[PDB]
Amino acid sequence: MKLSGVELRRVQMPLVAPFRTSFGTASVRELLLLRAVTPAGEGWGECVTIAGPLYSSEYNDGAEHVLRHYLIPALLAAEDITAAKVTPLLAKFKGHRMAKGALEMAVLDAELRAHERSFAAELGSVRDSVPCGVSVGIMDTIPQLLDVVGGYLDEGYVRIKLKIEPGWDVEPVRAVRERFGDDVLLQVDANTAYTLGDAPQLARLDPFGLLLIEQPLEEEDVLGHAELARRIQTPICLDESIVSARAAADAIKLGAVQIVNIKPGRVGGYLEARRVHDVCAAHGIPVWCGDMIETGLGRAANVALASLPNFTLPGDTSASDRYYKTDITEPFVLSGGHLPVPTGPGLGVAPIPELLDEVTTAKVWIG
Amino acid sequence: MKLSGVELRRVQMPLVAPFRTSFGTASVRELLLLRAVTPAGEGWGECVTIAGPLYSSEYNDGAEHVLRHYLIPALLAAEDITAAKVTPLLAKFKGHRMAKGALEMAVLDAELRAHERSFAAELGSVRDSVPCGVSVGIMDTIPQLLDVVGGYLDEGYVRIKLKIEPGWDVEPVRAVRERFGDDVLLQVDANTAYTLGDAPQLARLDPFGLLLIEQPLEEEDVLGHAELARRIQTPICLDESIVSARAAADAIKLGAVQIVNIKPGRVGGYLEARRVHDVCAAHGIPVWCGDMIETGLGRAANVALASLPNFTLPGDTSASDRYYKTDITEPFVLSGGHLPVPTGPGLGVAPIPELLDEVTTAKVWIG
Amino acid sequence: MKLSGVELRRVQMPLVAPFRTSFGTASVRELLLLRAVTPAGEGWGECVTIAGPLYSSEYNDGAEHVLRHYLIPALLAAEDITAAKVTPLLAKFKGHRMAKGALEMAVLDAELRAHERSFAAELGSVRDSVPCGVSVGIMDTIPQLLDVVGGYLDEGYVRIKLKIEPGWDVEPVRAVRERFGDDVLLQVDANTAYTLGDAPQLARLDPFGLLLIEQPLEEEDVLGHAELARRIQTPICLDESIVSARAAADAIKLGAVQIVNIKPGRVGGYLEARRVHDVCAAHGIPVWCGDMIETGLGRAANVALASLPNFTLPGDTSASDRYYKTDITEPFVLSGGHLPVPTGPGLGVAPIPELLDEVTTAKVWIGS
Amino acid sequence: MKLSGVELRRVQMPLVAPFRTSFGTASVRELLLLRAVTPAGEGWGECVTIAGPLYSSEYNDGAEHVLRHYLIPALLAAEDITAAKVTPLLAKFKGHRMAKGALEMAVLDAELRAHERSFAAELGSVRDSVPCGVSVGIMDTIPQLLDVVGGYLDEGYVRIKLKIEPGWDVEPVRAVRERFGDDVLLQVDANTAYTLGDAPQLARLDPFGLLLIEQPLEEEDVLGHAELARRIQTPICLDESIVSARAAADAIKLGAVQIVNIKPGRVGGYLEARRVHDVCAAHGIPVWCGDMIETGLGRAANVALASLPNFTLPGDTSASDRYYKTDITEPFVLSGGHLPVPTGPGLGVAPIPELLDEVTTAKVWIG
Ligand SMILES: CC(=O)N[C@@H](Cc1ccccc1)C(=O)O
Ligand SMILES: CC(=O)N[C@@H](Cc1ccccc1)C(=O)O
Ligand SMILES: CC(=O)N[C@@H](Cc1ccccc1)C(=O)O
Ligand SMILES: CC(=O)N[C@@H](Cc1ccccc1)C(=O)O
């Protein structure tokens, strides 16, 4: 595969409802899409960065910059190229995992389309559909939360994840437990908002039987998570900290984690994500698929990834309409709490050009 | 892919020279080959069992029996089949890894041929050729060893591995070191022939600067290998003990291993072998590709596997003519101490039917 | 003595009731018997393999094959043989523990009959009878389970062991506890059906005061069992994982086990079983005797084994009639919840030839 | 067996040469023999106590007393008796292991004679002869030591063990090494004579390549031995400390021992000794057979014991004439450095009544 060039698009899509997290609130999703062009044809990738460096150090303008002036040129200068070779070709560049991952996705989609092979087949899928949960944001009042939660249970979502932060943890959890009972699969996610000094407050979650607490402490504090685990009954899950398969292995060896959230972009691609899955499986650590409010492109890849054998807890890969009135691909629709795994070549979906154009803010060709 | 049936062949091929190991001597290679037939076309697999249970519990008649009456029927009874799905379809059968691996290889070869994709591309190859060492057997006299070794260094093999056993360890190593010097990459392999009580004898290998000692103790004695490592300077490498990715992770956590030999058949296939590679990479453990004196079918798959990024020590995948005057495939030929990675669809090689018939002792169709 | 030869028999015996486990269901027991012939006399051994490799990698056709073409010829080729020497003579062959154990049993039985000595005396028995529990399979409905359990408590079995699997764990246990109370000795056995990810489901068994959970995870996952132990209150017992005395020592050192199930065939014979017992005793680990639905030959040997001092929990060595209408030997009959330890030479029992012939499906002689 | 009674004999036998140890010197062996009488017939046992409590707390008069007033009556009062049941029948009496062991030996010899079975068969012998070393005492001068050692090497003993103590360690070892070379198997035995404060002195034995140092510290100081092992290169072997299989397991778990000396009387019998062997084997710890200057009765039982599979270092079971001009049984005679394993029923030997009467100093019947 000689790479001819890449099209970078900025896209802006309105959200059905504001999504609030410990780091801020969003009414819109701003993202980067990549169209890799080969002599064979096209492949699509999606960057999971957001507008500013509030979740991790990467952000949309930074990703666009590093892709345009370093990563894409390094691939255009090479002669062969395969999805596997992207990693060594870009290894000299430190970090920028979300950007590398987006690029690897587009290359992989082009490569697999050319062999008429699905993402699911390449990654090692063993099922045709996957059970889906939903991530629910911080709200202004308890009764507004109970409404939203009740709504998603009614749609048939099999698990609820609540965003939490200081001032919004024990009360929402108690309320959800009182209203909906102890059989609902329930977990929480802090996005780094606590310190080890807040252990006694997080220990107040012990009686509610949560599946897990996701990333209570900061990204770099792996040892702190192992300390925290000695003080609370709720199992620790890491997200922000798991930047690679090596990072997962390290965290596991140190007793810092019992369940891992896998997000392809965060780890530098679908291929590294597979390795994270394999490392966790080998240590008996369950994994589940995270979501970065992707369009249908990323959603299609994630649903494929989530059909691997060690994904044994429900993921955040919700139906398109949880986030968007109008997706840019044919949308994902919940059915019996599950999403179906795509079947065509590559991602098994492509942007509907009319819908994509409506939401494109900017476009540039790199050749 | 619906699987139509499988052809089981017994094959017997003479060896250029007797090959002696701590468990016995062979002048011939007896093996099983599989031809998986689909509507799409064919795929080939090779079983790495030997005639009796002297290296592991599996052996040729046992593999033929379990394939024929359990493994193959379970795949024929399934609706849709993929290489990835072979594992869960056969999971209810305990052990029989070499047999399962052979069957998975044939299915994978058929699947990939149909997508016009190489084993190298599927596994994640990052190089076009690989450096090759050679495994050298136990001999009757030191001077006969020095001859053979000198011969293989002359052909351009980049590393020597010596089979060892009680009564044939320190002397052969000292002799090779006195005659060829300290810069030759040199290692040893015991195939389980020692006990922890022999530590003082194995410590006598400390001054010769060996890369490793492969499987000094029995397959089940992982804790003993960790104990042995506290007593000798030579790094421990495991082979027989590494039956899966989980087994590699367990050995590594216990300090029982510093370098891992990967053999696809021993671990239940090329897809598990890839997971062993990934688990070892994530812990910083170098791997290298083993050899089971395969025909060109297995040799092609191994050379592909050995081109993955964490294979950072030379493998035992020697040229065809190290073992055979006449291979059943287009032979592998050493060139600058390297073998080239195959490029066509699937294995990138197939049996030359006239050569295969000369060496086939038996044949049966399962349908 | 020189071994003259060995007779291999395939035997099929119907079960009184279907027996369901996490790995399948059986209405019949298919097994291998061995008759070792020496100048001194005959001895009997029993292989505990089943028809396919669903419990371990070994199975009946595989055991027959490896016995016939490797194990038995290696013993015929030797000069002098004792039960103890069987292990080194067969050491070059990797695995095949059940097959080796069957052959050792037959050689030992012949050796001990010639010295007019019981299995019990050879192994180090300290009691004349042993308390017996029962292993109860998975059923289609909770009320059918309660009926069967109630029946076995009525016969005087001192302990109940329930087979479990995903979808059949917390409910059957709760039901048995509700119907029969908290004083019944109760345990469960998964035969490898769970993963470490199922720890929260297995932790739901915490309030029911089980003695143990046997082999919740796969055979090779010893470190995982140590991890599981830190997450559940029910003590872990290993079965499939304990393939030798070295394996038991390793599991114990890693905190992966608190109680060990000993099955002689699984460990490569009665002599290795004794060593497992002794290693466990030295580390303070209780053991108990497992059952593989053996005929009266294996049952006799197991009852003997179970009379050793560190067998301090009731075993699965149930009475013959729990499994079989007609045993091929003098049957074992429960009495005050106990089975008596056999007293004659060797096993202390032998097949009744007419009963054995009714049930024999194939027979072959292997000699030098 | 109902036990009818036991005959206790005191015996005194002169030694060919004085035997000096860190705890004293002996020119004579004073011991207890037991003759257990059943309806079936007789069996013999031997107590390995010495005259005073200088090696352990047990001694001849103490053993005679405890046997006569506690142990033997407890067995006479029992209804059925087997060698295995001795242990539970005597369990209420604390300690007195050498005494219990002597009684168990006699009962076992009677039981096995009645079944026409050898000690070797009962214990699990896998060889017909065993290699033998010799234990050499402390001497007044270095040149006298070199003579005695040279003599025993000339007879074909395969290993030398030197008794040592403060003032007699480094010099004798150096001298033996300078005279006879580095290939002689050489070890030392301190019988508890050092403290952890003498570690720098014991570290001066590092360069002489000793197989082991036996019981450098006191019986109770198991943790101290583990400390000492961190400070010297010579492997630690325990003798006095290994009072049971449980003790061996404890010592091994604490890193206090690499090699174990088994003495049946010290551990409370041949049946516990077999358990010590099995425990050590399971942990990969080599064992070897000790000697307490027994008569041919004990010697016969020890040679049988030493033929078990994990006895992988030569024992102290020397030929009868190393200690005695005239043994009370048919004597053990070295042959190619080996002693042959007895073959008859029970011990395979019995006292020659005229020789026994010559050396009997006292006799009593307990009935
Ligand atoms: C899509 C986007 O970049 N929004 C916000 C922050 C944000 C994103 C996603 C969820 C919550 C807040 C920003 O950084 O300005
Ligand atoms: C569904 C969700 O909460 N996704 C992110 C939050 C997030 C949304 C959008 C962009 C970045 C982060 C997480 O799992 O933390
Ligand atoms: C042809 C063959 O498999 N021979 C040996 C095995 C063997 C293979 C390779 C090297 C040495 C021995 C046997 O007796 O089973
Ligand atoms: C090339 C070689 O030495 N292979 C095996 C030994 C072996 C050869 C042939 C068949 C089976 C095993 C090893 O790596 O240990």
Ligand SMILES: CC(=O)N[C@@H](Cc1ccccc1)C(=O)O
């Ligand atoms: C007789 C036999 O081995 N039957 C089952 C297995 C089985 C044995 C014991 C209990 C349940 C199932 C089979 O392999 O099909």
Ligand SMILES: CC(=O)N[C@@H](Cc1ccccc1)C(=O)O
């Ligand atoms: C009585 C019983 O449950 N035995 C086996 C199951 C089993 C029965 C028969 C043959 C093989 C396995 C166990 O404890 O796992």
Ligand SMILES: CC(=O)N[C@@H](Cc1ccccc1)C(=O)O
């Ligand atoms: C004869 C005797 O038991 N003498 C010494 C001990 C002894 C035995 C063996 C070797 C040295 C001293 C004593 O107890 O005083």
Ligand SMILES: CC(=O)N[C@@H](Cc1ccccc1)C(=O)O
């Ligand atoms: C032969 C020898 O050195 N035996 C004892 C010493 C000893 C001899 C005789 C009686 C008691 C102890 C030991 O190994 O420590």
Ligand SMILES: [Mg+2]
């Ligand atoms: Mg998070």
Ligand SMILES: [Mg+2]
């Ligand atoms: Mg090897």
Ligand SMILES: [Mg+2]
């Ligand atoms: Mg079980």
Ligand SMILES: [Mg+2]
């Ligand atoms: Mg001593």
